[PDB]
Design a protein around this ligand. Sequence first.
Ligand SMILES: COc1ccc2c(-c3ccc(C(=O)O)c(C4CCCC4)c3)ccnc2c1
Length: 281
Amino acid sequence: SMQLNQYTLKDEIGKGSYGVVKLAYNENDNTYYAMKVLSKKKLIRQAGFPRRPPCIQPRGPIEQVYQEIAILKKLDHPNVVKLVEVLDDPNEDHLYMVFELVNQGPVMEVPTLKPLSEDQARFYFQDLIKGIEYLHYQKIIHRDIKPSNLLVGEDGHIKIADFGVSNEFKGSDALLSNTVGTPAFMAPESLSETRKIFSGKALDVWAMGVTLYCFVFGQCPFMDERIMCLHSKIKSQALEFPDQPDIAEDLKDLITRMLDKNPESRIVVPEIKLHPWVTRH
Ligand SMILES: COc1ccc2c(-c3ccc(C(=O)O)c(C4CCCC4)c3)ccnc2c1
């Protein structure tokens, strides 16, 4: 182990888009936390080398980690991770973010041969709806919703984690020309060279749909090892359900509406919350 102020850093417990997460014992309150460890110089290099003056690269890449911190400081919800401390010396390269620990870790790593039952998928999906509606109300889009970023706590409820690429918008929605994400979870409107911008909140809904499909089938609905073919399938392949496991028709309807390739007609979170599959047991 190693010592960092009042914390004793132990094994790696996660690795997200940036940095690594360590188990950290706080000697002041005899409690374990999760500590994300980052290198400022490594974050700057991850955005790419800057271009000589003549999809524009941001001028100051280090601003995204400080946006992530500002976003996390704003959020207090039982289905969202809780940032408790930031350790950041301006004369040091490392940055540390301390979170309340969510003991069981990620709910699923896609693909899996052990999907969730329909009733357990509903319980976790109800948690995901609560967390996402709260983020959207706080004018936050997550941009990387997938099962591996949903942590299961001691209480069996999930918390949304990995805000590394999250964005705060002004107004009613985020207006995007391009976006980040895990390709198998990216919405079709984000994968074409077009003149048209798209809604950030509808990207999160599409990713919730791919997540729910993963919860019950253990793999994404559109999949290919060849990136160009994956993008083509997301944009042009009709959604299909495997013959087994057999799932309820109302669940198929909900997933179909979340995975509407047209973001204008795609179901919105206030409607998802009242869908018959979500409100029954
Ligand atoms: C038991 O295992 C864990 C692992 C990560 C945790 C975290 C945590 C903190 C920050 C990030 C991030 O990269 O931004 C992450 C990601 C790493 C991969 C999954 C999401 C997790 C928080 C609280 N309890 C955790 C418990």
